[PDB]
Amino acid sequence: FLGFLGAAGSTMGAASMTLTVQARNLLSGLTVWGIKQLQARVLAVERYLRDQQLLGIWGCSGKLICCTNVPWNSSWSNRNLSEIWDNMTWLQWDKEISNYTQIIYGLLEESQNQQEKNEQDLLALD
Amino acid sequence: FLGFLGAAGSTMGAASMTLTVQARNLLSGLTVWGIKQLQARVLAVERYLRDQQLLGIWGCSGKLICCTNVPWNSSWSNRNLSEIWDNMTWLQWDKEISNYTQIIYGLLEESQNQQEKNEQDLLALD
Amino acid sequence: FLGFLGAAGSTMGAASMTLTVQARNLLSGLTVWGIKQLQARVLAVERYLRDQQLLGIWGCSGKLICCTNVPWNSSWSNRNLSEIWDNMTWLQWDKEISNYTQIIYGLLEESQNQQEKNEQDLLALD
Amino acid sequence: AENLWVTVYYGVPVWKEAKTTLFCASDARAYEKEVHNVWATHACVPTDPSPQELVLGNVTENFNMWKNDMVDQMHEDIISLWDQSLKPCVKLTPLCVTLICSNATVKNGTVEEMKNCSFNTTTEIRDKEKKEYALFYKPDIVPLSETNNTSEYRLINCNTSACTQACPKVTFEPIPIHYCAPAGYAILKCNDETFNGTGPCSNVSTVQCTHGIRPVVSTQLLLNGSLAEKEIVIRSENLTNNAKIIIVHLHTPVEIVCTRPNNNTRKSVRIGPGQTFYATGDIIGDIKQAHCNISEEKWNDTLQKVGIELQKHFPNKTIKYNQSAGGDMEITTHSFNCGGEFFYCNTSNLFNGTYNGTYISTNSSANSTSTITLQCRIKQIINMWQGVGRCMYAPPIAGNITCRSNITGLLLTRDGGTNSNETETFRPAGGDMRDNWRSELYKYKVVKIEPLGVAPTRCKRRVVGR
Amino acid sequence: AENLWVTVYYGVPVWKEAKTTLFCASDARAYEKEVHNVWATHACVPTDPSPQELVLGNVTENFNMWKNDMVDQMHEDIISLWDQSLKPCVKLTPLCVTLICSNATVKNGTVEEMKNCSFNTTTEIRDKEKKEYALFYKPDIVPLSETNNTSEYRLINCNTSACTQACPKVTFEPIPIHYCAPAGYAILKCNDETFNGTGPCSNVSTVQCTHGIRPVVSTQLLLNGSLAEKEIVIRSENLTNNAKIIIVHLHTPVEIVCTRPNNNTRKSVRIGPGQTFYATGDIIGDIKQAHCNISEEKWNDTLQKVGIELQKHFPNKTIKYNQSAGGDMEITTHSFNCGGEFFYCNTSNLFNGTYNGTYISTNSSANSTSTITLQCRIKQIINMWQGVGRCMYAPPIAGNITCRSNITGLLLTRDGGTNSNETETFRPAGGDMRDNWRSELYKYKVVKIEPLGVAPTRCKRRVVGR
Amino acid sequence: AENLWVTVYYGVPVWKEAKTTLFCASDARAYEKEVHNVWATHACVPTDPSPQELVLGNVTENFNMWKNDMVDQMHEDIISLWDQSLKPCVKLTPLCVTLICSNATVKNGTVEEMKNCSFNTTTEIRDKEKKEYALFYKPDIVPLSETNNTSEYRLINCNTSACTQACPKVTFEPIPIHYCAPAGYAILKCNDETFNGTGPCSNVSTVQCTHGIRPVVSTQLLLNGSLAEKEIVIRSENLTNNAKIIIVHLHTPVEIVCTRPNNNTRKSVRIGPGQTFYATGDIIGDIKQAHCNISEEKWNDTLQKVGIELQKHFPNKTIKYNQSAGGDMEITTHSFNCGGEFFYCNTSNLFNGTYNGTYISTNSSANSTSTITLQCRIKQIINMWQGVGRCMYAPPIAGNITCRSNITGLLLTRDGGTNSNETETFRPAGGDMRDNWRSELYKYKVVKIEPLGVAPTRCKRRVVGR
Ligand SMILES: *[C@@H]1O[C@H](CO)[C@@H](O[C@@H]2O[C@H](CO)[C@@H](O[C@@H]3O[C@H](CO[C@H]4O[C@H](CO)[C@@H](O)[C@H](O)[C@@H]4O)[C@@H](O)[C@H](O[C@H]4O[C@H](CO)[C@@H](O)[C@H](O)[C@@H]4O)[C@@H]3O)[C@H](O)[C@H]2NC(C)=O)[C@H](O)[C@H]1NC(C)=O
Ligand SMILES: *[C@@H]1O[C@H](CO)[C@@H](O[C@@H]2O[C@H](CO)[C@@H](O[C@@H]3O[C@H](CO)[C@@H](O)[C@H](O)[C@@H]3O)[C@H](O)[C@H]2NC(C)=O)[C@H](O)[C@H]1NC(C)=O
Ligand SMILES: *[C@@H]1O[C@H](CO)[C@@H](O[C@@H]2O[C@H](CO)[C@@H](O[C@@H]3O[C@H](CO)[C@@H](O)[C@H](O)[C@@H]3O)[C@H](O)[C@H]2NC(C)=O)[C@H](O)[C@H]1NC(C)=O
Ligand SMILES: *[C@@H]1O[C@H](CO)[C@@H](O[C@@H]2O[C@H](CO)[C@@H](O[C@@H]3O[C@H](CO)[C@@H](O)[C@H](O)[C@@H]3O)[C@H](O)[C@H]2NC(C)=O)[C@H](O)[C@H]1NC(C)=O
Ligand SMILES: *[C@@H]1O[C@H](CO)[C@@H](O[C@@H]2O[C@H](CO)[C@@H](O[C@@H]3O[C@H](CO)[C@@H](O)[C@H](O)[C@@H]3O)[C@H](O)[C@H]2NC(C)=O)[C@H](O)[C@H]1NC(C)=O
Ligand SMILES: *[C@@H]1O[C@H](CO)[C@@H](O[C@@H]2O[C@H](CO)[C@@H](O[C@@H]3O[C@H](CO)[C@@H](O)[C@H](O)[C@@H]3O)[C@H](O)[C@H]2NC(C)=O)[C@H](O)[C@H]1NC(C)=O
Numbered sequence A, B, C: 001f002l003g004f005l006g007a008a009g010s011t012m013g014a015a016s017m018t019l020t021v022q023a024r025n026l027l028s029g030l031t032v033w034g035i036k037q038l039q040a041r042v043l044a045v046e047r048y049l050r051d052q053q054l055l056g057i058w059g060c061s062g063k064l065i066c067c068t069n070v071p072w073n074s075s076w077s078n079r080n081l082s083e084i085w086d087n088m089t090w091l092q093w094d095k096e097i098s099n100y101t102q103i104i105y106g107l108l109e110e111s112q113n114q115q116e117k118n119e120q121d122l123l124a125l126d
Numbered sequence D, E, F: 001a002e003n004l005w006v007t008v009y010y011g012v013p014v015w016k017e018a019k020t021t022l023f024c025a026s027d028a029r030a031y032e033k034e035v036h037n038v039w040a041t042h043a044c045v046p047t048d049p050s051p052q053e054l055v056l057g058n059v060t061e062n063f064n065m066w067k068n069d070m071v072d073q074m075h076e077d078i079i080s081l082w083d084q085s086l087k088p089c090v091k092l093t094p095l096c097v098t099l100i101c102s103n104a105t106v107k108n109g110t111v112e113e114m115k116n117c118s119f120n121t122t123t124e125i126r127d128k129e130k131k132e133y134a135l136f137y138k139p140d141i142v143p144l145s146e147t148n149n150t151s152e153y154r155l156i157n158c159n160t161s162a163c164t165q166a167c168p169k170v171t172f173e174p175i176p177i178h179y180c181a182p183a184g185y186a187i188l189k190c191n192d193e194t195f196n197g198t199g200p201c202s203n204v205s206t207v208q209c210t211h212g213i214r215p216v217v218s219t220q221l222l223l224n225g226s227l228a229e230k231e232i233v234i235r236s237e238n239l240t241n242n243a244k245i246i247i248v249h250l251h252t253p254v255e256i257v258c259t260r261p262n263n264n265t266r267k268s269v270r271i272g273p274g275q276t277f278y279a280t281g282d283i284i285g286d287i288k289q290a291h292c293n294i295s296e297e298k299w300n301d302t303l304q305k306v307g308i309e310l311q312k313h314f315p316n317k318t319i320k321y322n323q324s325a326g327g328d329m330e331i332t333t334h335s336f337n338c339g340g341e342f343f344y345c346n347t348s349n350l351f352n353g354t355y356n357g358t359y360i361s362t363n364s365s366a367n368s369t370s371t372i373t374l375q376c377r378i379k380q381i382i383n384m385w386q387g388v389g390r391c392m393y394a395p396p397i398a399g400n401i402t403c404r405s406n407i408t409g410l411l412l413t414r415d416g417g418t419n420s421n422e423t424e425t426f427r428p429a430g431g432d433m434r435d436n437w438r439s440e441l442y443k444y445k446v447v448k449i450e451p452l453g454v455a456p457t458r459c460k461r462r463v464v465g466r
């Protein structure tokens, strides 16, 4: 156990080495307190499954760092590679990048991974 | 949202363009009613996993459209391919292909993909 | 149906063919008695997913067999390979390999597969 | 070209028709105030769902309203919540004493469907009773089980079964409810108006949720619901048999007004260790029989237009309209809740005046005219769901009770068949709250999505390592 | 050969024994009939299983019939279900009153274990209590708190606890019970048949569900249960300690009949609103006594076959089968749930007559012989779970009350040890419903599957690009 | 070089402000001790957690002890446990008769905080009573609605509500609870000395679970709350507003001691069938006023330092402590419970006599001295949650009660604004056990993790075949 959240305040670089440690912690564990206890685990499991599906949708299944073919935009950020990766925490970077939540997501869903799957279908068609 | 089965009234060729959106919504959110309310979502989760596992069993994990290596039996059908793709709906086709449920499935599991995996096993021992 | 557990008395090599059969059994099934049932089912589902995640973490998602990139240690075992595959059962081999539970697993996470994923990210960075 | 190849597709559009449980979704604004709404309690999900639809095109399927088990599910949901709603509250039991009885002596007069009665209860102290009185409707209070004395009476029910006074907070609003299905099912609308309760619905939509259904309880009339903007649509599981119930949709809302012109002061007696029973006290000088109103041509010309549908569904004969032929006031009157008290009205007078349903076209049309006025019983002891669910006492309400609704449809039968030679009668029908549910739910159906499918195609193969 | 490599395998056939909840798997048919059924309510699982047994071969592991917590599972479940089944029914609280008592004047004689009493109860009207009477089985009826008047009595329980009259739908019907396991667990059956319940079972199967258990709480006999596999087997946790329970399973059944040879008539009282009591009314006139039957031949021949094997555990020493160690009739008699008319029979006649448990082989052959007949008490108030649960009152049943069973085994001890020089004694026993459970469950154990593993093999590497 | 590319990092460290239900993690040994347990409950989990804490460093964020919702979560959790933990237990209802009260005449004196009273109850036999007697402390017992004779009295409750005796097993020891969070959430701590209830915390840790909280309930003085950090601290939702509470920890604890030395004898009556009950019988005579003690030395020298800290938010001006603002003894006393026995101790003797806090440094050391004494009432009808929750009846414990605690913080307000020239003065507040919870929970908050984060890198994409 290298510490759950144990690199949060560091560089993106640092955090990227830890991802499994946190990923595993996402998913574990006369009266009706049992309903409360069940309801929580059904919430946790349901949530986890949402995001596994979103990795399926972006074709980032079965990995924890995953590349695509979509370019960046300066409107998303002008700050260079180091001015993120060497310079800040994810706890900051999310609050920076939040504007393109949904945007990048849908842009991936179809125009990346479905388009890869269109191209791959046409490759499978030989 | 395109709506559940937003191209039902459309050709199987057309339907193939829509799949990500239809797939996303297979998973969503003093009284005993909490039992009923949970039981429904638990039933939903259960079906989702049975599918995922099955797709893995066929060597069709991840991809929403998966090519196989099983050639057809004319007993399943022998009509022209454009009748199927370019003309009928899924809502027709299902009623025809349903005969060969299990017949196709066991083959995909074993003598196809488990045999592909036996070959991969022997190829990984090299 | 070969039966559930249908090769436990066999050598590991002999039994290793069966996996899809065994895998398909892993997930099925004015009162409080619904509690007993959900409290069983929402144990089972979670137990399954913990393992799927672990297979994810090693880069073995979907497939019922997966080779690694790590060689053996005499401390793990030092016996001949036919004792293992061509003789002992899995229930028998379990009694040995039990020792290096955690030990091999954390190695498979980090110094194996995260190192493979670092190499892969470095190759993606290119 | 090649062999065809098996190819797997996920999230494919196909389904089957099947049974399931559903969510009670609600308008979210209720449970701010209406914890224990008697139907759609705070156990229903505060939601106000977005009413999204796709009329499909090219879809082809049959519907059958009489077989949508949501009808039964709703009937279960209702009765479940009914029994939940009454559980916190106080029984009549300690008040089941010998009653000594007299008149509603008010404004030098009396109320003849009522009696006055006198009785004892404990205070909060077990050894200490005193004496008190109140008024009741004659259906509430029965002359005592032995014929010793005309002034002696009891509670009607107490020789069989204890019943509770509802707690005052627990709220009787029949609010709008949304049914919505859980993931992997969907709701299908039959948008095919002129769908006559069974047949191919040529025109179907996906929806995620129903409109706001109201659980209005009624005995012969359908209220505040399914306006058939197409026609005065007449329906049954088989109109050709008089053994079946008949539904009519009105083509238009037809108003009804109802009044208690009888103005109680709520008498309030402390019984036992801190419980209050609520009862009839003195009456403020508005003191006349409860009644209801609809205009004659409104009623008539509708019943004529109904007759047109009846001589479309039957060959030409002289159908007539007549009273509910037998049973208690529960069956034979129309009965309502007037947003407080329960009413039992003279629909046996209303079902009259009639020539051949269609051939009232001898009039066809006219100027507007006065209210047909229907007398009504009121009473406060109820075996609510035709004896199903907990028996209840409704607490009385003081002051200016009066109320209004729309007739939006009807429940009927034909009469018994004579030789029926060019002649027939039809009558208002007691039925089930299921028949309100049939009239309100026919246009919905629930289906199970199967996302899996296999197809031939010439993906020439997934060759090893391709 | 080649270098060896970590290789991961999933769905590996391996497991460990562990504790868990299990399913109430059952016949479906009773749920149509029996809301809150005494065992397998309408809310248990309509599985009616398919018995997909399979011996795995080369399979060898230690069972322990005393340590499988399913014994406790069944104990907690049946007890919890019992009180749950009885919460809906009739509370006898207001019936706790002074009794004025007298002759059960049946046939102008007296039924000598029964008496007559008169008392008062509330009619529906609170102020109106009135007089009536009932018959009772004497044992539950105690002379009143000071015995000033020899006619004055009360119900036994009144000073300790309230009691419940059972509802009709709470059927004491022992329909077959199955257990089955949730996925990731499985049930291993001992098929090393004639195995005796601890040690390695060398022949083992997967089963998805158990055989049908019958839960009847037979107090010293074992009734309608499993037969033994081939031998008349003895199982005990330690044969050499006389302070353990001993179990005999019979390979051949022995039939028994029980009867109330007297014709009861039901009587009832409206005790306030709702609660209608059941009294015994008249008995149509005969003064026989309730009893059960067994032939000396079957019994002796059984006890000989047993006494041969028992004296091979306890070398030749003359076993004598003998009457109770003593205590309450409610512990020391034999008891049964036939018709709910709970019997308490003369075990004290039956365990007798015994020469050396082996050397009765010197007898070992006779012609046919009539039944030994055990007279019994019947009674109406039971503290069911040998001191826990609600107090239950059994309604009397009118008419014939007669029934048949198979003797399937015995619960015993060896007697207290004298010098025991070529001599021993044995006595009936009745410690726990767990003993009835042990008498069935000895041949199941429950494992959890652990489907992950790794191995060395020549998997040269999953090289980059491979 | 090149543009950047969209890449998906799973498992990114990040969190959001959130709300959730939480685990009730507990000491494991309590589950052995009582059938239910009052906290550490049969409904909570004996996870008995390891105290895992990780200091993060570099990161900082806000904490807000006023807005932290867990205050309310615990407030609901406590009361929710309360009703269910009482619901099966014995009810006062049959005891609610006219009481014949009299003096507590004992051994050349009286028990002047009490009455001796006589009454009747149903025996187990519904048709009999006799006469019985007990002592009570005066507050529970009030004259009858008219004193036709002055001995006519009743219990305070019956004109409002029934009440229940605690099942004796349900012993009110506030056994430590740890709060802990389900997966995908985490708990953050403000490990930061002189954090003052709001704003950023300079240093943060993650924990799976809290320190064990003792859920003591008290009106004015925090008992057995945790030892505060370094120096005295003042927390408020608004320092400036005198109408908002000021909560103060002591730094070092101060000891408090109490007893009812009076040797009370336990007694019982069988109040109908099927219950058991307790009340104060005889007194063995040496009777004293019930009381508590604190050493002036410690107490004064504490109030000194507290006054000095108040002056660091109230410059130069003199600060004083004064008696309660008055009203109900439910507000004016320090009320607390030990061993299950209730206490109501006066604070008007305690809060007095204050020079300027800075000048009180003139005291600051002495040779040791006797205690102040606080005068204590007793009552045994209770309305637990500052007037909410059930009506609850406390059985008297056997004889000697002696018990002890640590003062560690105060509930205060500054009084209304007079001329206030160089002056301010303060009183013990009415309080809420929410704020007793705040006194602990201030240094926690709960958040949810959103493990995705999109980002740039010069990954050379994943083109076809890459
Ligand atoms: C050991 O195993 C034996 C069977 O091998 C059990 O003995 C049987 O027990 C059942 C109950 O479990 C007895 O059932 C009762 O039979 C009465 C007679 O039924 C016959 O006659 C009537 C007309 O008189 C016919 O209609 C009927 O079809 C039969 O032909 C019934 O009158 C009883 O009715 C009551 O119970 C039923 C439900 O069973 C209710 O629906 C009724 O309303 C009513 O309340 C009842 O059905 C059966 O007779 C027994 N047979 C014998 C030979 O004894 C033992 O109980 C069992 N012992 C142990 C220790 O487990
Ligand atoms: C709904 O209809 C019934 C049936 O008509 C009403 O009850 C009364 O029923 C009788 C027929 O059985 C009606 O006819 C006759 O009236 C004359 C009046 O002089 C009388 O002499 C006859 O003996 C016979 O009663 C009667 O008019 C009718 N009463 C009323 C007021 O309609 C029933 O009352 C109707 N429902 C309501 C709520 O009024
Ligand atoms: C089950 O066993 C008990 C104990 O044996 C039965 O009660 C009676 O117990 C006595 C010994 O305490 C038995 O022995 C003697 O019998 C002679 C008979 O003439 C008598 O004179 C002695 O006073 C003494 O009672 C007695 O036989 C035995 N009675 C019976 C009928 O067994 C108990 O009755 C037995 N259970 C049942 C339901 O009968
Ligand atoms: C099964 O039934 C038979 C009788 O049908 C029982 O026979 C027992 O047989 C032995 C001889 O083999 C008898 O022993 C002798 O008894 C006399 C008189 O007490 C004594 O003087 C001799 O020294 C010798 O011990 C024994 O009495 C006889 N028992 C009876 C009660 O007849 C056999 O015991 C029965 N077995 C069971 C399981 O009950
Ligand atoms: C807290 O301390 C007060 C003050 O010692 C206790 O109660 C009573 O307080 C009043 C002033 O608020 C005192 O003054 C007056 O005394 C005369 C005596 O004849 C009386 O006629 C007036 O009505 C007024 O009460 C009174 O002396 C004082 N009593 C005592 C015994 O000190 C109070 O009891 C303490 N609080 C609690 C909860 O016990
Ligand atoms: C701790 O206890 C001491 C007493 O042992 C408290 O001492 C207070 O000291 C001042 C003078 O140093 C006294 O002031 C006097 O007050 C009267 C009335 O206003 C005035 O006429 C005099 O001219 C003078 O100002 C004060 O009365 C005295 N208090 C007592 C109770 O003796 C000290 O304040 C206590 N600390 C706390 C926390 O209150």
Ligand SMILES: *[C@@H]1O[C@H](CO)[C@@H](O)[C@H](O)[C@H]1NC(C)=O
Binding pocket: C095, C096, C097, C098, C099, C100
């Ligand atoms: C370790 O492996 C050995 C050799 O097979 C076996 O005897 C032992 O039980 C194992 N012990 C543990 C702790 O896994």
